[PDB]
Amino acid sequence: CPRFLKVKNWETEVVLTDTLHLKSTLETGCTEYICMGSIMHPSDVATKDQLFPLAKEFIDQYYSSIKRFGSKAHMERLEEVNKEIDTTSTYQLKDTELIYGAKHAWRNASRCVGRIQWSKLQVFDARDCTTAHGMFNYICNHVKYATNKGNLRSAITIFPQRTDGKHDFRVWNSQLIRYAGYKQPDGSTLGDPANVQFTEICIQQGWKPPRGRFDVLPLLLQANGNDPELFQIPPELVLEVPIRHPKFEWFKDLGLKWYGLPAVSNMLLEIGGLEFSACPFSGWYMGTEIGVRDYCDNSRYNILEEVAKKMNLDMRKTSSLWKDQALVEINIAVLYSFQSDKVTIVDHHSATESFIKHMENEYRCRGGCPADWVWIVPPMSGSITPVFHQEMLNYRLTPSFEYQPDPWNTHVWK
Amino acid sequence: RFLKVKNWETEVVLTDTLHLKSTLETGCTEYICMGSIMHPATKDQLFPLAKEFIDQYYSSIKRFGSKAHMERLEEVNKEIDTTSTYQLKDTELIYGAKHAWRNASRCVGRIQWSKLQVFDARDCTTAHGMFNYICNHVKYATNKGNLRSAITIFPQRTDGKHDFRVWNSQLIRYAGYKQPDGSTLGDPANVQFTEICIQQGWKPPRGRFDVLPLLLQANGNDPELFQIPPELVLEVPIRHPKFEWFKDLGLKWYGLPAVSNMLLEIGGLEFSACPFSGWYMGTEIGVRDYCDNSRYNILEEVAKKMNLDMRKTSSLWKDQALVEINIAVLYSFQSDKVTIVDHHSATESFIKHMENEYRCRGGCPADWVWIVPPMSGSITPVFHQEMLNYRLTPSFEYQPDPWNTHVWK
Ligand code: HEM
Ligand code: HEM
Ligand SMILES: Cc1cc(N)nc2cc(-c3ccc(OCc4ccc(C#N)cc4)c(CN)c3)ccc12
Ligand SMILES: Cc1cc(N)nc2cc(-c3ccc(OCc4ccc(C#N)cc4)c(CN)c3)ccc12
Ligand SMILES: C[C@H](O)[C@H](O)[C@H]1CNc2nc(N)[nH]c(=O)c2N1
Ligand SMILES: C[C@H](O)[C@H](O)[C@H]1CNc2nc(N)[nH]c(=O)c2N1
Ligand SMILES: [Zn+2]
């Protein structure tokens, strides 16, 4: 690979120079002859010999970041890590290194448009947790802290790392807060279609479903490789926003609402070769995640048609753009409702503008900023946002957030 | 290896084998994806490229390894020997132009690829001849509003000192002028080309929608200016089905999109002048041409007449005015019976096209970054369709702007 790679912004003419790609760690899935940039997921534990260089790489990075590279504390930390891998096949991160690694997994997340915030992350160390009840306690505290009565604060809670792969900690939920989905005998779906499979697991595990349109799912929590256990989030911890429109008084009659806190909980955090299989993290929403995807995806709540009816649009011709018109109004209502209730939210114009400033800053201070254009560009109004015209380079740095298989597909039931 | 692509809305899975035939590079490596980067012969290089192309031609007409196939290869080898190049047969030229379109990973319109009128202009020698061929193309492709896809292919590159080039980036485009106070009148995308035309002797009317002259270069000579006969230039006034003030904005656009600055590669031969045209997808005009900050940039004016609150981004005033502008464009072309396709219909056709190509061809190279429309992305079916991008030949390629290379004789 060449030392310098340039990217151009075709709207402003600004050219930026990337050297950080030289530190890329993993395969992207692409080759010289095929690009897999639109593949959702392109791309048993580590041996002693695999772990040694991965830890040294991270430790070196850490001591370089605190401007102590080659120092006595650096060499002593290396040697202590090396002995621990020798005599235990693993090692333990210091609290400082845990915090640094979690912030940089966020900093490195190429699909995240919100990374201008990466250094303001509250890290909850939950590595002393031993049971699913204790996981529940840690998650409730996380939810309450991050919600902050609507003044949301980004946070991650980190449970014990993988050991032999048979004692994994896992949150079986895909997000800490999501709405149940129920397939009906007639083929229709009540609630959120995206969550039908997980809802069925919960019901089989013992959950009694209220069977409504917006039922908060219980937590299904797995500690130390044991069978997962069910817990109800205290509903006073779940901040929700009813959706209304500043002009259309009838919009509230749709009975729509959504929850304030997006808290993805099924990803794996990799730091220094260590694998944190339970690491729920939360920020705040960009409006289009709710208004475009959650509400208007055909396989989600799919409300475009009903909203267009109440708007009395012609729905016979696609070229009337009735779908685009209703989509805008739905997203206006979502932003209006969160702002009115003083729940943190960012519109897609503000967020993408901030991301561009962030990316420019990262290129100049760090030598680059891996970014996945396919994910960064918002799902509506793409070209009237600045990221659309911004060339990006995508590559994988560590520490990193990784996908992992769903736990019900791999779990060995006791 | 067989690669799978999934549609996450319908759960359909397709299996790609066609990527195994590509030879040109994408720009990506195993460690870095350049998917969003806009732009990532001799006797010895030429014969394998020619042989590959002749081989796929005769395989396409189900005569692979035939007597005609065998003799064509020897004819081509003998010719590259004695002239350092070769000439395509007419059948080969047509097959290669259609497949350059079929292989254009960035084009959502490719369900039409085999409906392409190919105009062979390889006998052309002067810019006057180029202008004649191009007028015929514009007249044929416009067809009084019932647009017909077409390409006109001028003589191929020889030594690189005798290139045929259309200096225009499209056959029909509007001029752009730098203003004294600092702003831009007309289309800012064409400011530089407009100045070259003025410097070359074009008298500019200095309006907002002045159709540019043709600047045409034959056999490496200085380019020459020509005016397209105005009766050949079909235009649409833009009005809105509900907002009667919209027509008062004075907006119009041309009906015929005809890209003229790309290079067509067939069997190792380079056709540096090959203008090709189809018909518009509404968002090309209504989103990019009208609403790019560095194009006509009209969102402010429209939202002002819509009386929207423009004080905060989260009112989505830009998004509202964007939809209304794209309604007007589609409504205007349709009312005037000028062919146009909306982005919902176009992307639906492309998903169908992908299914066809995977069935009959083993795949379809497709550039998600370009295929997904510039508005309303995820409510179109391509947003949820995984695509594999790879480079097949014959192909359309980018080439340098002629004024950056031309030694003015
Ligand atoms: C603070 C405000 C934040 C905003 C506005 C934000 C915004 C976004 C958005 C819009 C996406 C695309 C999600 C989708 O389409 O489903 C995303 C993805 C992502 N975000 Fe951020 N995010 C924020 C905080 C965070 C935090 C705190 C973390 C981790 C520490 C994080 C890590 C990620 C990751 C890993 C992805 C990719 C997820 C995947 O591939 O499934 N984000 N973010
Ligand atoms: C017939 C109707 C057609 C439609 C609706 C259509 C649609 C489109 C659209 C929307 C784009 C994106 C262009 C941009 O954003 O600037 C595009 C690109 C492209 N089209 Fe098609 N197209 C059509 C016909 C054709 C024909 C006839 C050819 C060639 C014979 C062709 C070759 C290409 C190529 C090479 C590109 C990529 C341009 C680039 O890389 O800059 N298209 N098309
Ligand atoms: C920290 C934070 C803040 C914020 N504001 N937003 C976030 C959004 C995500 C995020 C990414 C992909 C997802 O998933 C994509 C997907 C789509 C379809 C299928 C299917 N079938 C499977 C996955 C989902 C959904 N939980 C969330 C993650 C973290 C966020
Ligand atoms: C056959 C056909 C039909 C149709 N319906 N549509 C088309 C649209 C294009 C097309 C692609 C890229 C472009 O170029 C984008 C660009 C952006 C920034 C810079 C810069 N700086 C330079 C070029 C331009 C512009 N003529 C047109 C090509 C063929 C089309
Ligand atoms: C097929 C395609 O890669 C897939 O639909 C992606 C596209 N880009 C996305 N971008 C974001 N932010 N979130 C998504 O879920 C997706 N889905
Ligand atoms: C930087 C980015 O690649 C560039 O803006 C691309 C993005 N996608 C596009 N898609 C289409 N159809 N046309 C374009 O000009 C672009 N521009
Ligand atoms: Zn790639």
The class of domain A18-127+154-164+268-282+352-376 in CATH terms is: alpha beta
Instruction: For residue B322, list chain A residues with Cβ-Cβ distance below 8 A.
Output: 381, 384
Residues 6+ apart with CB under 8 A from B276: B97, B101, B149, B150, B151, B152, B258, B259, B260, B262, B396
Chain A: residue whose CA lies nearest to B17: A34
A128-153+168-239+403-407 folds as Nitric Oxide Synthase;Heme Domain; Chain A, domain 2 (3.90.440)
Tell if the CB–CB gap between A35 and B28 is shorter than 8 Å: yes
| DSSP 8-state symbol, A9 | B
Phi, psi for residue B406 in degrees, rounded to 5? -75, 125
Whether A197 and A153 have beta carbons less than 8 Å apart is answered as no
Contact A22, A3 (CB under 8 A): yes
CB burial of B156-175 (b: ≥16 within 10 Å; e: otherwise) equals: bbeeeeebbbbbbbbbbbbb
- CA dist A267 and A405 (Å) reads 9
CA distance B76 to B51: 8
Instruction: Please say whether the beta carbons of B145 and B336 come within 8 A.
Output: yes
How far apart are the CA of B23 and the nearest CA of chain A, in angstroms?
Answer: 7
Residue A217 DSSP code: P
Torsion of CA B263, B267, B269, B270, to 10 degrees: 10
Breaks in chain A, after residue numbers (C to N greater than 2.5 Å): 43
Number of alpha helices (DSSP H) and beta strands (DSSP E) in chain A: 12, 18
CA distance B333 to B284: 13
Q: Which two tokens stand for residue A317?
A: 């011709």
Class of domain B235-257+280-345: alpha beta
Beta bridge partners of B107: none
Q: What homologous superfamily is domain B16-122+149-159+263-277+347-371 in, according to CATH?
A: Nitric Oxide Synthase; Chain A, domain 1 (3.90.340.10)
Question: b or e along A34-60 (b: 16 or more beta carbons within 10 Å of the residue's beta carbon)?
Answer: bbbbbbeeeeeebeeeebbebbbebbe
Distance CA(A133)–CA(B219), nearest Å, equals: 81
| Candidate of B9, B376, B384, B386 to mutate for ligand 5, largest count of ligand atoms within 8 Å of Cβ | B384
- Angle among Cα A55, A61, A65 to the nearest 5 degrees reads 145
Closest by CA to B289, choosing from B170, B181, B193, is: B170
Q: Which two tokens stand for residue A46?
A: 């580590």
Distance CA B278, CA B116 (A): 9
3-class DSSP state for residue B378? helix
> Which residues share a beta bridge with A222?
A170
β-partners of residue A259 are A240
Ligand 7 centroid to Cα of residue B33, in Å, is: 4
Q: Where in chain B is the domain with CATH 3.90.340.10?
A: 16-122+149-159+263-277+347-371
Q: Which residues of B touch A308 (CB under 8 A)?
A: none
The CA distance from B13 to A32, in Å, is: 24
CA distances from B386 to B10, B20, B104, B112, B354 (A): 12, 18, 17, 21, 11
Positive/negative CA dihedral, B304, B309, B315, B320: negative
Distance (Å, rounded) from C-alpha A82 to C-alpha A76? 10
CA atoms within 13 A on the CB side of B107: 21
The C-alpha atoms of residue B272 and residue B264 are separated, in whole angstroms, by 7
Which residue's C-alpha comes closest to atom 21 of ligand 3?
B8
Angle at the Cα of A336 from the Cα atoms of A335 and A341, rounded to 5 degrees: 100
| Six token digits for residue B4 | 């799978």
The tokens of A411 are what? Answer: 């779990």
Whole-number Å distance between alpha carbons of B306 and B316: 13
Class of domain A240-262+285-350 as given by CATH: alpha beta
Pick from A328, A168, A262: nearest CA to B327: A328
Which ranges of A221-347 would DSSP assign to H, the alpha helix?
A: 287-288, 295-296, 304-311, 322-340
Binding residues of A: 38, 112, 175, 284-285, 289, 374-375, 388, 403
3-state SS of chain B: helix, strand, coil percent to 5? 40, 15, 45
Nearest chain A Cα distance for residue B404, angstroms: 18
Q: Which two tokens stand for residue A201?
A: 């697991």
Four-CA torsion A267, A269, A274, A275, nearest 10 degrees: -10
DSSP category for residue A235 = G
Measure the CA–CA gap between B327 and B322, rounded to whole angstroms. Answer: 9
Judged on CB neighbours under 10 Å (0-12, 13-18, 19+), B244 is: exposed
CATH class, domain B123-148+163-234+398-402, is alpha beta
Rounded Cα gap, residues B54 and B64, in angstroms? 9
Paired tokens of B216: 């045409």
Residue A266 identity (one-letter amino acid) = N
Angle subtended by helix axes B43-60 and B67-83, to nearest 10: 160
**Residue B288 and residue A383 in contact, taking contact as beta carbons nearer than 8 Å:** yes
Concerning whether B107 is annotated as a catalytic residue, the answer is: yes
Instruction: Identify the CA nearest to A93 among candidates A59, A134, A138, A65.
Output: A59
Which residues of chain A form CATH 3.90.340.10?
Answer: 18-127+154-164+268-282+352-376
A12/chain B closest Cα distance in angstroms: 8
Contact A118, A107 (CB under 8 A): yes
End-to-end CA distance of chain A: 49
CA distance linking residue B189 with residue B166, whole number of Å: 17
C-beta of residue A328 within 8 angstroms of C-beta of residue B319: yes
**Ligand 6 pocket mutation pick from B108, B291, B370 by most atoms within 8 angstroms of CB:** B370
Question: A65: which residues sit within 8 A by CB, 6+ positions away?
Answer: A100
| Count of CB atoms situated within 10 Å of the CB of B74 | 9
CA distance B265 to A7: 27
Q: Give CA–CA dist B237/B332, Å, rounded.
A: 7
SS3 A58: helix
Which one-letter DSSP state was computed for residue A175? B
Do the beta carbons of residue B275 and residue B267 sit within 8 Å?
Answer: no
Helices B90-102 and B43-60: crossing angle, nearest 10°?
Answer: 90
Residues of chain A with CATH 3.90.440.10: 128-153+168-239+403-407
For A220, the 3-state DSSP assignment is strand
- What are the beta bridge partners of residue B177? B185
Please report which helix (H) or strand (E) contains residue A318, including its range: none
Q: Taking a C-beta distance cutoff of 8 angstroms, is the pair A280, A263 a contact?
A: yes
Which residues, other chains included, contact B187 with Cβ-Cβ below 8 Å and sequence gap of 6+?
Answer: B173, B174, B175, B176, B289, B295, B296
Is residue A355 within 8 Å of residue A389, measured between CB atoms? Answer: no
Buried b (16+ CB within 10 A) or exposed e, A361-397: ebbeeeebbbbbbbbbbbbbbbbbbbbbbbbbbbbbb
CA distance B218 to B131: 10
Q: Does the beta carbon of A27 lie under 8 angstroms from any beta carbon of chain B?
A: yes
Instruction: Find the farthest-apart pair of alpha carbons in chain A and give their distance in angstroms, rounded.
Output: 73
